[PDB]
Coordinates of C-alpha atoms in Angstrom, one line a residue:
Chain C
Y293 CA 0.2 0.0 0.1
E294 CA 1.3 3.3 -1.0
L295 CA 1.0 7.0 0.7
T296 CA 1.9 9.8 -1.3
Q297 CA 2.3 13.3 -0.1
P298 CA 3.7 16.3 -1.5
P299 CA 7.1 17.2 -0.6
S300 CA 6.6 20.6 0.4
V301 CA 4.0 23.3 1.5
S302 CA 5.0 26.7 1.9
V303 CA 2.3 29.6 3.3
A304 CA 2.5 32.8 5.4
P305 CA 1.9 33.6 8.7
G306 CA -2.1 33.5 9.9
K307 CA -3.0 31.7 6.5
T308 CA -3.9 28.2 6.2
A309 CA -1.7 25.1 5.3
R310 CA -3.1 22.0 3.9
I311 CA -1.1 18.9 3.9
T312 CA -2.7 16.1 1.7
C313 CA -2.0 12.2 1.8
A314 CA -3.1 10.5 -1.4
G315 CA -4.2 6.7 -1.2
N316 CA -6.1 4.1 -2.8
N317 CA -9.7 4.3 -1.1
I318 CA -7.9 5.9 1.8
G319 CA -11.1 7.3 3.2
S320 CA -11.9 3.6 4.2
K321 CA -9.0 3.9 6.4
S322 CA -8.1 5.3 9.8
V323 CA -5.5 8.0 9.0
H324 CA -3.0 9.8 11.9
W325 CA -0.7 12.7 11.3
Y326 CA 2.7 13.4 12.9
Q327 CA 4.6 16.5 13.2
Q328 CA 8.6 16.6 13.3
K329 CA 10.2 19.8 14.0
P330 CA 13.7 20.0 13.5
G331 CA 15.9 18.0 16.0
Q332 CA 12.8 16.9 17.9
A333 CA 11.1 13.5 18.5
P334 CA 7.6 13.2 16.3
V335 CA 4.5 14.0 17.9
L336 CA 1.0 13.1 17.4
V337 CA -1.1 16.1 16.3
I338 CA -4.0 14.5 14.8
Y339 CA -5.2 11.0 15.1
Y340 CA -8.1 8.7 13.6
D341 CA -8.5 11.1 10.8
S342 CA -9.9 14.2 12.6
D343 CA -9.6 13.8 16.4
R344 CA -7.1 15.7 18.1
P345 CA -4.8 14.1 20.9
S346 CA -4.5 16.1 24.2
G347 CA -2.6 19.1 24.3
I348 CA -2.9 19.8 20.5
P349 CA -4.4 23.3 19.5
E350 CA -7.8 23.8 17.6
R351 CA -6.3 25.1 14.6
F352 CA -5.2 21.6 13.8
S353 CA -7.6 19.5 12.0
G354 CA -8.1 16.6 9.6
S355 CA -10.4 14.9 7.5
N356 CA -10.4 11.7 5.0
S357 CA -12.6 11.0 2.5
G358 CA -12.4 8.9 -1.0
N359 CA -8.6 8.9 -1.9
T360 CA -7.4 12.1 -0.2
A361 CA -6.7 12.8 3.5
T362 CA -6.1 16.3 4.5
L363 CA -4.6 18.0 7.4
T364 CA -5.6 21.6 7.8
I365 CA -3.4 24.0 9.9
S366 CA -5.2 27.5 10.3
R367 CA -3.9 30.7 11.5
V368 CA -0.2 29.2 10.7
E369 CA 2.9 30.3 13.1
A370 CA 6.3 30.0 12.7
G371 CA 6.1 27.5 15.4
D372 CA 4.3 25.2 12.9
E373 CA 7.7 24.6 10.7
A374 CA 8.0 20.9 10.7
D375 CA 7.9 18.0 8.6
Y376 CA 4.6 16.0 8.5
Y377 CA 4.3 12.7 8.0
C378 CA 0.7 10.6 7.6
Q379 CA 0.2 6.9 8.5
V380 CA -2.1 4.1 8.3
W381 CA -2.4 0.7 10.1
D382 CA -3.3 -2.6 8.2
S383 CA -4.1 -5.0 10.9
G384 CA -4.0 -8.5 9.0
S385 CA -0.7 -8.1 7.0
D386 CA 2.9 -8.7 8.2
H387 CA 3.5 -4.6 7.7
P388 CA 0.8 -3.1 9.8
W389 CA 2.6 0.3 9.4
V390 CA 2.7 2.4 6.5
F391 CA 4.3 5.9 6.4
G392 CA 4.0 8.8 4.2
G393 CA 7.3 10.4 2.4
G394 CA 6.7 13.4 4.0
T395 CA 5.8 17.1 3.5
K396 CA 8.2 19.9 4.6
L397 CA 6.0 23.2 5.9
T398 CA 8.0 26.1 5.5
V399 CA 6.4 29.5 6.9
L400 CA 7.3 32.4 4.9
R401 CA 7.3 36.3 5.2
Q402 CA 8.4 36.2 8.8
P403 CA 10.4 39.4 9.9
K404 CA 13.8 39.6 7.6
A405 CA 16.8 39.7 9.3
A406 CA 20.2 40.5 8.3
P407 CA 23.2 37.8 8.8
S408 CA 25.5 38.5 11.7
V409 CA 28.7 37.2 10.5
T410 CA 32.0 36.4 12.3
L411 CA 35.0 35.4 11.1
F412 CA 37.7 34.0 12.9
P413 CA 41.3 33.4 11.8
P414 CA 43.6 30.2 12.4
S415 CA 44.2 29.6 16.0
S416 CA 47.6 30.1 16.8
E417 CA 47.4 26.8 18.5
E418 CA 46.1 25.3 15.4
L419 CA 48.9 26.7 13.4
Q420 CA 51.4 25.1 15.9
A421 CA 49.6 21.9 14.7
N422 CA 50.5 22.7 11.1
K423 CA 46.8 23.6 10.1
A424 CA 45.2 26.8 9.4
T425 CA 41.3 27.0 9.1
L426 CA 39.0 30.1 9.0
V427 CA 35.6 30.2 10.6
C428 CA 33.1 32.3 9.1
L429 CA 30.1 31.9 11.4
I430 CA 26.5 33.3 10.3
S431 CA 23.9 34.0 12.8
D432 CA 20.2 35.2 13.2
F433 CA 19.1 35.6 9.4
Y434 CA 15.9 35.4 7.8
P435 CA 15.4 33.8 5.2
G436 CA 17.4 30.8 5.7
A437 CA 18.9 30.6 2.6
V438 CA 22.4 32.3 2.1
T439 CA 25.3 31.8 -0.4
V440 CA 28.9 32.1 0.7
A441 CA 31.8 33.3 -1.3
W442 CA 35.3 32.7 -0.1
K443 CA 37.6 35.4 -1.8
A444 CA 41.7 35.5 -1.7
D445 CA 42.9 38.7 -2.2
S446 CA 40.5 39.9 -4.7
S447 CA 39.9 36.5 -6.1
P448 CA 37.5 33.8 -6.0
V449 CA 38.3 30.6 -4.0
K450 CA 36.6 27.1 -4.3
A451 CA 38.9 24.6 -3.1
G452 CA 38.9 23.9 0.4
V453 CA 35.3 25.5 1.0
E454 CA 33.2 23.3 3.4
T455 CA 29.9 25.2 4.0
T456 CA 26.8 23.8 5.9
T457 CA 23.0 24.1 5.0
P458 CA 21.2 26.7 7.3
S459 CA 19.7 25.1 10.6
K460 CA 16.7 27.0 12.3
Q461 CA 17.4 28.1 15.9
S462 CA 14.8 28.3 18.8
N463 CA 14.1 32.1 17.9
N464 CA 13.1 30.7 14.5
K465 CA 15.9 32.4 12.8
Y466 CA 18.7 30.5 10.9
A467 CA 22.6 29.9 11.7
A468 CA 25.1 28.6 9.2
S469 CA 28.8 28.1 9.2
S470 CA 31.8 27.9 6.4
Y471 CA 35.4 26.6 6.9
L472 CA 38.0 27.7 4.6
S473 CA 41.0 24.7 5.2
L474 CA 44.3 26.4 4.2
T475 CA 48.0 25.1 4.3
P476 CA 49.9 27.3 6.7
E477 CA 51.8 28.6 3.9
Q478 CA 48.4 29.5 1.8
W479 CA 47.4 31.5 4.7
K480 CA 50.6 33.4 4.9
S481 CA 51.1 34.0 1.3
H482 CA 47.8 36.2 0.6
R483 CA 47.4 39.9 1.8
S484 CA 43.7 38.7 2.4
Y485 CA 41.0 36.4 2.9
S486 CA 37.3 37.6 2.4
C487 CA 34.0 35.9 3.6
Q488 CA 31.1 37.6 1.5
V489 CA 27.7 36.3 2.9
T490 CA 25.2 37.0 0.5
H491 CA 21.6 37.1 2.0
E492 CA 18.6 38.2 -0.2
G493 CA 20.9 40.0 -2.7
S494 CA 22.7 41.8 0.0
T495 CA 26.6 41.0 0.7
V496 CA 27.7 41.3 4.3
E497 CA 31.6 41.9 3.9
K498 CA 34.3 40.8 5.9
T499 CA 37.9 40.0 5.1
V500 CA 40.6 38.4 7.4
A501 CA 44.6 39.1 6.9
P502 CA 47.5 37.2 8.5
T503 CA 49.1 40.8 9.0
Chain Z
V281 CA 5.5 8.4 30.6
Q282 CA 8.6 8.6 28.6
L283 CA 11.0 6.3 26.4
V284 CA 14.6 6.5 26.5
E285 CA 16.9 5.0 23.9
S286 CA 20.3 4.0 24.3
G287 CA 23.2 1.7 22.5
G288 CA 23.5 3.6 19.4
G289 CA 27.0 4.4 18.1
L290 CA 29.3 3.9 15.3
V291 CA 29.8 0.1 13.6
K292 CA 31.4 -1.5 10.7
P293 CA 29.6 -2.9 7.9
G294 CA 28.7 -6.7 8.8
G295 CA 28.9 -5.9 12.3
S296 CA 26.2 -6.2 15.2
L297 CA 24.7 -3.8 17.4
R298 CA 22.0 -3.8 20.1
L299 CA 19.7 -1.1 20.9
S300 CA 18.0 -0.6 24.3
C301 CA 15.0 1.4 25.2
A302 CA 13.9 2.2 28.5
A303 CA 9.9 2.8 29.4
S304 CA 8.8 4.5 32.6
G305 CA 5.6 6.3 33.7
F306 CA 3.2 3.8 32.3
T307 CA 2.7 0.2 32.5
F308 CA 5.0 -1.4 30.1
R309 CA 3.0 -4.9 29.4
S310 CA -0.1 -3.3 28.3
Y311 CA 1.1 -1.4 25.3
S312 CA 2.5 -2.7 21.9
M313 CA 6.2 -1.2 21.1
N314 CA 7.8 -0.1 17.9
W315 CA 10.8 0.7 16.5
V316 CA 11.0 3.4 13.5
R317 CA 14.1 5.0 11.9
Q318 CA 15.0 7.9 9.7
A319 CA 18.1 8.0 7.7
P320 CA 19.7 11.9 7.5
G321 CA 17.3 14.1 5.3
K322 CA 14.7 11.5 4.8
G323 CA 11.4 10.2 5.9
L324 CA 10.2 8.1 8.8
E325 CA 10.5 4.4 8.4
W326 CA 8.8 1.6 10.3
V327 CA 11.3 -1.3 11.3
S328 CA 9.5 -3.5 13.6
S329 CA 6.9 -4.1 16.2
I330 CA 6.0 -6.6 19.3
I331 CA 2.3 -7.1 20.5
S332 CA 1.3 -6.9 24.1
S333 CA 0.2 -9.8 26.1
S334 CA 0.5 -12.4 23.0
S335 CA 4.0 -11.1 21.5
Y336 CA 3.5 -11.3 18.0
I337 CA 6.6 -10.0 15.9
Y338 CA 6.6 -8.0 12.7
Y339 CA 9.5 -6.5 10.4
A340 CA 9.9 -4.7 7.3
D341 CA 11.0 -6.3 4.1
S342 CA 14.6 -4.4 4.5
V343 CA 15.4 -5.8 7.8
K344 CA 14.2 -9.3 8.0
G345 CA 16.6 -12.2 8.6
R346 CA 18.9 -9.7 10.5
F347 CA 17.0 -7.6 13.0
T348 CA 15.5 -9.0 16.4
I349 CA 13.0 -7.2 18.2
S350 CA 12.6 -8.1 22.1
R351 CA 11.2 -7.1 25.5
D352 CA 11.8 -7.5 29.3
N353 CA 8.6 -6.6 31.2
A354 CA 10.5 -7.0 34.7
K355 CA 12.6 -4.2 33.5
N356 CA 10.5 -2.4 31.2
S357 CA 12.8 -2.6 28.4
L358 CA 12.4 -3.0 24.6
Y359 CA 15.5 -4.1 22.8
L360 CA 16.5 -4.4 18.6
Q361 CA 19.4 -6.6 17.9
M362 CA 20.6 -5.7 14.6
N363 CA 23.1 -8.0 12.6
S364 CA 24.6 -7.9 9.1
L365 CA 24.5 -4.2 9.1
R366 CA 24.5 -2.2 5.7
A367 CA 25.1 1.4 4.9
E368 CA 21.3 1.5 4.2
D369 CA 20.8 1.0 8.0
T370 CA 22.5 4.3 9.1
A371 CA 19.6 6.2 10.7
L372 CA 18.2 7.7 14.0
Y373 CA 16.0 4.8 15.7
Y374 CA 13.1 6.1 17.7
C375 CA 11.3 3.9 20.0
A376 CA 7.6 4.2 19.8
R377 CA 4.6 2.8 21.8
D378 CA 1.1 1.6 21.0
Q379 CA -0.3 0.3 17.8
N380 CA -2.4 1.7 15.3
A381 CA -1.2 5.5 16.4
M382 CA 2.1 6.0 18.1
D383 CA 1.2 8.3 20.6
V384 CA 4.8 8.5 22.5
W385 CA 8.2 8.8 20.9
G386 CA 11.7 8.9 22.5
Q387 CA 14.0 11.4 21.3
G388 CA 15.7 8.2 19.8
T389 CA 19.6 7.0 19.2
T390 CA 21.8 7.6 16.3
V391 CA 23.3 4.3 14.4
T392 CA 26.3 5.0 12.1
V393 CA 27.2 2.3 10.0
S394 CA 30.9 3.4 8.6
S395 CA 34.0 1.9 7.8
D396 CA 35.8 4.8 9.1
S397 CA 37.2 4.7 12.5
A398 CA 36.0 6.3 15.5
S399 CA 37.9 9.7 17.0
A400 CA 37.2 12.4 19.8
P401 CA 37.3 15.9 19.1
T402 CA 40.1 18.2 19.0
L403 CA 39.7 21.6 20.6
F404 CA 41.2 25.0 19.2
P405 CA 40.1 28.0 20.9
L406 CA 39.2 31.2 18.8
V407 CA 39.5 34.8 19.0
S408 CA 38.6 37.6 16.9
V409 CA 35.5 34.4 21.4
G410 CA 34.9 31.1 20.1
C411 CA 35.7 27.4 20.5
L412 CA 36.6 24.9 17.3
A413 CA 36.4 21.0 17.6
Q414 CA 37.6 18.8 14.8
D415 CA 38.4 15.3 13.7
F416 CA 35.6 13.8 15.6
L417 CA 33.2 10.9 14.5
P418 CA 30.4 10.0 14.5
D419 CA 28.6 13.4 14.6
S420 CA 27.5 13.4 18.3
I421 CA 28.7 16.5 19.9
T422 CA 27.6 18.9 22.2
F423 CA 28.7 22.2 23.3
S424 CA 29.0 23.7 27.0
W425 CA 30.7 26.7 28.7
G426 CA 25.4 26.5 18.7
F427 CA 26.1 25.8 15.0
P428 CA 25.6 22.6 13.0
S429 CA 28.4 20.2 12.3
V430 CA 30.4 20.1 8.7
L431 CA 31.8 17.0 7.3
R432 CA 35.3 17.6 6.2
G433 CA 37.7 14.4 4.9
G434 CA 35.3 11.8 6.3
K435 CA 35.2 13.4 9.8
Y436 CA 33.1 16.1 11.2
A437 CA 34.1 19.7 12.7
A438 CA 31.8 22.0 15.0
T439 CA 31.8 25.5 16.4
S440 CA 30.6 27.2 19.3
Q441 CA 30.4 31.0 20.4
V442 CA 29.8 32.8 23.6
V443 CA 36.1 28.0 29.0
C444 CA 34.8 25.3 26.6
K445 CA 33.5 21.9 27.3
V446 CA 32.2 19.2 24.8
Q447 CA 30.6 16.0 25.0
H448 CA 31.3 13.3 22.8
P449 CA 30.8 9.5 23.0
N450 CA 34.3 8.8 22.4
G451 CA 35.7 11.6 24.7
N452 CA 34.9 14.6 26.9
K453 CA 37.4 17.4 25.9
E454 CA 37.9 20.9 27.9
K455 CA 39.5 23.8 26.9
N456 CA 40.5 27.3 28.2
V457 CA 39.5 30.7 25.7
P458 CA 40.5 34.2 26.9

């Protein structure tokens, strides 16, 4: 048995989000919904098609008919940002549980925030370890999509760059870090190294130098 | 009412590993118990289940003939013996109770199937204040006194920003920062 979900739903705050779960005559089965915020355990937010477990707010509701089950979230808040999974239970089979592929709920149009960038040179204890690592820390920005350009002197650098994907913090803003691995000679050789993080079409300039 | 998983860590392919789940706050013998996993960046996948009283056992087709579930009602614990581990088994394993609908979940425990060897972090203090841990595996680091870890050359690195202590299964490290 196959449960299909759209991979992504995106809505603004206060608006309604609808997550669908497609299945053959799924209206004849009981459908449960799980909410999984990043880093947390999953939470049963809707069970038996439309009922709410104790503790779940009333703006969460569900329904199930025909070949489509729906999870509706009204008055969406930033906190509702999570992956949502539908699930059914088939008694007399060797595979009782069936989970949907999951749907990522993104909450758009939250207050925009420029990134707070911090650029650490290689530690003097690291240079005595025959290593040189630049650390570009990027904090408190929204939306959570940035591009990082590492420049030596005034020229692009692509090798030795390891940039992470932004993860959401507790305050619903994003943080990311970028590492530029150099030999201690690649470091002292150049007059500067730059971490030009671009967010929403606006670079935040920060240069570091061995001297 | 709570579920606490443990036993997860780094293992080489073809190796074996036993997962343990500790239940508390409810009558353990009155509920069916389940194992559900989640590969990095992917969806939930049911693995195995054991029923209450009768103890009928079920498995997913990708784990049959290798995984073994069981329980100890006197100790309120659920087990998952995993044998012949492959790369496809790398995931965060959740312990969850009840049938039909899983009402209670644990925060899970991570299982990493890899040929690479385990290592403790190496701390370097940062000044512009920061703290830089490198060359640790698996990626199960916590910072005490927050940024996500990056993968470089098969090993992970992580930075914290505010005396810098860390928690890693292979070794706890402390380091001084001006």
